[PDB]
Amino acid sequence: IDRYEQVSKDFEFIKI
Amino acid sequence: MEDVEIKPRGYQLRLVDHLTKSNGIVYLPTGSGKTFVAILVLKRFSQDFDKPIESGGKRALFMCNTVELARQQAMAVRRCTNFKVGFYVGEQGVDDWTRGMWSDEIKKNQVLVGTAQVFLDMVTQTYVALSSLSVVIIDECHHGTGHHPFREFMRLFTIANQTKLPRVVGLTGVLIKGNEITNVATKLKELEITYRGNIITVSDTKEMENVMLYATKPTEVMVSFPHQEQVLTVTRLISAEIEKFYVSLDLMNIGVQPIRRSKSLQCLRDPSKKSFVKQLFNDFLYQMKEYGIYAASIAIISLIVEFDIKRRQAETLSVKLMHRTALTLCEKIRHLLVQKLQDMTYDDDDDNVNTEEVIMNFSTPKVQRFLMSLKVSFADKDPKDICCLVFVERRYTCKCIYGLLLNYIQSTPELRNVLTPQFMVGRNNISPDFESVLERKWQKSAIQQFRDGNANLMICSSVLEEGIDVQACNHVFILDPVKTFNMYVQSKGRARTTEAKFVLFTADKEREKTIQQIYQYRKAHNDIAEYLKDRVLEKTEPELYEIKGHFQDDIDPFTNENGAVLLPNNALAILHRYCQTIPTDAFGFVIPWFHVLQEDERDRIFGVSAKGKHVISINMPVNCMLRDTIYSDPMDNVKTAKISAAFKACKVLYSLGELNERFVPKTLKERVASIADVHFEHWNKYGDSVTATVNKADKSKDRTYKTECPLEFYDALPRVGEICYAYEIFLEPQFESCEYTEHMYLNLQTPRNYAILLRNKLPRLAEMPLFSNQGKLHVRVANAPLEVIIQNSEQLELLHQFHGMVFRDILKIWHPFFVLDRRSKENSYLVVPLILGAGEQKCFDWELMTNFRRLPQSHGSNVQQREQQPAPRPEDFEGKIVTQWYANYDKPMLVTKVHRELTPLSYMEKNQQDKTYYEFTMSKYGNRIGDVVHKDKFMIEVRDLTEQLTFYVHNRGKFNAKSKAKMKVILIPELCFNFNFPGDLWLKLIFLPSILNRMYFLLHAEALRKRFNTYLNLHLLPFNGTDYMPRPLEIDYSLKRNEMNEMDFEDKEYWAKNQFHMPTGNIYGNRTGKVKPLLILQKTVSKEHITPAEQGEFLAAITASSAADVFDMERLEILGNSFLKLSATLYLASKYSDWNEGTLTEVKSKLVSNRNLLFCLIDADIPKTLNTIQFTPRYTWLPPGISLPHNVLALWRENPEFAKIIGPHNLRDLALGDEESLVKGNCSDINYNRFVEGCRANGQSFYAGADFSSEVNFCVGLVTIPNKVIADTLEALLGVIVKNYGLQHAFKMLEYFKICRADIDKPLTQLLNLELGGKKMRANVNTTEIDGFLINHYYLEKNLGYTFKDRRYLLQALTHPSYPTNRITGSYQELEFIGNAILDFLISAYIFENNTKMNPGALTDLRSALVNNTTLACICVRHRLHFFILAENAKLSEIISKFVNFQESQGHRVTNYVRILLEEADVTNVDVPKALGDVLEALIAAVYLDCRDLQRTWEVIFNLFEPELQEFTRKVPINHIRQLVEHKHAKPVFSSPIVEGETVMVSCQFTCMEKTIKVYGFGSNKDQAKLSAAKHALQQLSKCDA
């Protein structure tokens, strides 16, 4: 769809 | 005092040293270096290759899994080693052979390269003895497990004789395949068992990343971006369009074509020309899901290009139409992609925000999180300390991500201040940019620009993950899936920065299937680390004993008679410092080896006394005078053994005098202090010393010497009543007797002449070349002296007064202070006219000299005198001298004809025929003369006389209009005053000064020749002695003032001819046999060709170039300089052979220094007789019978403080009358006073402190000669003796100049031409090992064109100092020292004897070009003699390889171009090594030493240098004027040379970028700054080229 999913500053770099 | 040497030995050298000790496996993640360690491990086991298998010969085996790897290994072995190489891969017709030809090819090839199948076939069923193999190295050994053929080949080792097995080592870059790793210990133990050796890996903490690979870790998180199955309606449309194309692609209804079948024969398939479009469509379908649509567009563009190429290849019309339909479909797809790209990105109004929003929407969710995380990371962070890098998996993905990141960065100007994009690809190159299309240059610019800090981001498809040493990025970007252990570990290693950050790009659906994966990957990394930690690596090796543990109790220090204490702890430091003192190629100093002895060898050399103890041996490098090994005494631990070994080595070094009493290595200044009293003794009496504390500015380059006349001229005044010798002078006109020269020609052949009257007999003199205005003149002095006797004193007075009159009036060489030199002193000879006497014996012409004591005054005549004085008879004017008093009082005018048929009433002769003589004279004159009385008498034709007195110039100034203008000179006889002097004698006397000046030095040359021949014991020869006929002087006209398997298959035959195969396909004559012996060499051995020493040569050697003479002394200077250099080199090599090359070169330079030559020529009393001042006679010449007043000279010679203030104006202050100047001689008391108080007024005037000497030196007998001319004189004399009598006689003349000390014990200064090279009796060991080192020496000798009787010299000439295995011969520097002089003289003599049209001075530039080190390197590489150099030094290895590649790229052309500009880059990093050039000189010295034949050595040298000797003579490259005139095409800006007088001598300024950029350089020598400017200009051209 070339739109994918919109994501914002509510992101996490979670530990392995 | 404790200089640090922190274990500088390379890890590669340490690994190779470990490998030769015992079997093992080496693992290095770094891509580079494995090839070099393989080359070294091959070279260590390389001996015994020449010997046949039947007699114990061995070979070497290479194993590579893939054929490309084998090809690269073969190329590397060819380029790096001098061994015959094979290449046997797959099914290249090898399995269909016979045992006999296997054996034959094993005979042919030494090292054989191949894969597993061919080797298993060779060993299993066509068995070659595994015991007949030297070394078997394998590459990527980690491929061999289980049933892999490496395992089988290793298992075959268990069947053959286990006591004769070869050495096996396995190179590897990764220990595990990287797919999946479980049970690490079991796999590593299995790999340990497979190859009978351990895994060895360096753990250096300096530049290898091995220890940091496991001692550091960054934070580890994943982005955890959500993601689902990718779906796109555009992809669905593409699939539907492809289906619509395919449902019609089954009815091509094309013509019949051959049926194509698959290799596996599974099913029928379409031909390649028909299935190529299907394959490309499938590839594009794969690419859209992985790459996107921009990469899809570029890929479909490439597909369109390939389709166009194929259609150009195609012919059928129906196929063309179907292909056109396919092209239309592809173009429609490309149009759709580009429409989407150009439409979605700017589908909103706010461009500044939408340009970024669309990219945040264009990107996949993974890339979306990537972009926003990078945005928030560089929201405000400074660009000073930020850098990161993107890892992908596909080459095209690099370009795709690059375009995406460009669109992103140009969208956000804030990140443009902090972020810079790039992209990098490997194989399958596509257009990356507008510059550096090739992958290698693109990547080179990549790495240099990234490491220079210009950029901070790039994308690579694991290109840089191989282990590149790029800057440690603080964060790592890995977009593509990371399911691979090796690239994961190397990517983590890319994040070695402390406290750095690392992200993982895994989807949420992909997370549960990759968390466990990252778990085993991390635990396997840890397990590999802890498995390698306990291995015996380099650190655990005894090489880390620099800690110098405290064990001084059981080892003692040393003290000498001086009492200085030698602490054994400092032994290593002082040995390293001494190793720093010895000369080196600037490729790092050489550290002594410390190889440990085995217990069996320890018992072999020592026995029970060393049981339970360790002993070490030091291998002092061959450069130092120590050559034998030193064995430490036994004790407990290895560290104490090393300490004792170093202490004993230091004691030995001190015992032999390499260290002073302070136990510190000596320097050059300390060493020359031991030679000052032996060689440079003569400097002491002049106030100077060889120490040379200060130089340059403090040097005074001018000195004053007292000139002396030849002994014949001294005290040569004729006496009264005693015999006197008159030598008639003959003048021979060589020009044709033209009417213009008729007066000049005829008057020179008259019997009347003048003779030099002497009290001393004169020797024979050469024929004198003179140049009048009309043409050349030949002058010779009569051999037989016409003996006469002076009757009375009055006759002598008349002679002397006539002599004075000639100079005073006819030549006008007069000054107020001149007086007749009545007393008998220097230059006391006289000139006397001669007339035909009784019979044919000429007698003195007393009639003329009685009536011509002084020329009558140029009296005029009023008109009254003519009408009252009788008219002179016409015959009185024939051949006389007249004067046109009414127009030019002082001009003497020569009568050449009488015209009795002409009257003053006659008209003009031409061009004014309307005018008569009377009216012409009365119109241009009439005042001060009245009218003419005799209007009917005769007339005279007269010709002008030149005022020149110097006749040493070939060029003329005659003009044709002048030629008619001159003979029209007609004068009235009664209106001119005649001296009644014979015109012929006048015209002969006008040449007297030049003749006298040249003879004044011809006498000196003759006396010097007599002395030299007397010393050389050749005076009794018939050529020399009283029978010598001097040859006429020679004019020096040269003076200005006078796959790709086809290539490898066609290279296979050259491999049989080896690398050593000199091409010779085309001669170097195309850029656009028997050798002639040297005459000097020919007459050196046989006395039949001993040419007599001509005095013209000596006269040429005396006259400096300052004078305007027709011949110069510079031409002999070149030969003399080269001969002196060779003699000094050979003399020093013979006398001192244990010295290293540096001190020998320094002492040789000191012997041939200008100061030494000047000081050793001053005591020779020679320079006082040099011709070095231009002969201007009217101002700076003292005639023989003419001198200064005796009282004035007596006062002059007694008061130097007063003699330094006498000025020329004070000299004309003297007013001498005829009485004082003629009879009395001494000046009058009144005038003497007036002068002495007039001259002292100079101090009270502006004349005080002036340089009076330079203007009045000629009056005293002094001259100022620059210091260069004296050394040039000594060199010229050396050169002329060498040319005439050869080396065999000219060697011993240096004893005359005391340059080389004569050995009282033996007259060896004559036999020095045949001296040996040093220590030779101790090297008479068996030649089998010498041959072992010299593998394939036959080809080396063939290319060099000389077969060595003794191979020892060849081995010594090929030994680089960085080579430990050689122990019988010294380094190559000792031989190179001699070879330098040998080559220099053999080329200088050749060019001097063979080239004569070349300008002297340009021969020096030619000689410099021939002897240039870059030229020597070019010659050595061209003949491919570099493969045989024995060296162990990495940086030297790649520099030599790069230089070889650069040379071969040009076909070994020596046509100017770039490397002559790179001459600056000799010893911007270096680009040409000195060892490569110097090995040729060493080989030349070896050739000479082996045969002792100078002629054969010349044969070899000429065969080497023939092409460049042809080319350079045709157009000689130059340096100084070259850099001066080549820049001025668009850069005429230069600067003066700034003399510094320090380590750096000169500095220069210039401009770059044509004119607008100013760049300046410096120089430790004169040409160094010019070469630096040349390389800056070259770099500017590279910018212009780029």
Author numbering:
A (entry chain B): 344 to 359
B (entry chain A): 1 to 1042, 1120 to 1149, 1169 to 1563, 1604 to 1722
Cite, word for word, the article reporting this structure.
In Drosophila, an RNase III enzyme Dicer-2 (Dcr-2), aided by its cofactor Loquacious-PD (Loqs-PD), has an important role in generating 21 bp siRNA duplexes from long double-stranded RNAs (dsRNAs). ATP hydrolysis by the helicase domain of Dcr-2 is critical to the successful processing of a long dsRNA into consecutive siRNA duplexes. Here six cryo-electron microscopy (cryo-EM) structures of Drosophila Dcr-2–Loqs-PD in apo and in complex with dsRNA substrate in the absence or in the presence of ATP were captured, illuminating the continuous conformational changes of Dcr-2–Loqs-PD after binding to dsRNA and translocating until forming the active dicing state and cleaving the dsRNA substrate into an siRNA duplex in the post-dicing state. Loqs-PD is a cofactor protein that comprises two dsRBDs that are responsible for recruiting siRNA precursor substrates for Dcr-2.
Similar to human Dicer, the N-terminal helicase region forms the base of the L-shaped structure and the DUF283 domain is located at the corner of the L and just below the catalytic active core. The previously unmodelled linker between the DUF283 and Platform domains (DP-linker) in human Dicer is now well resolved in Dcr-2 as a structural element that interacts with the RNase IIIa domain through two α-helices and one β-strand. The C-terminal dsRBD interacts with the DP-linker and shields the RNase-activity centre. Although we cannot conclude whether the dimerization is an in vitro artifact or whether it is physiologically relevant, this finding helped us to solve near-atomic high-resolution structures of Dcr-2–Loqs-PD in the apo and initial binding states under conditions without ATP.
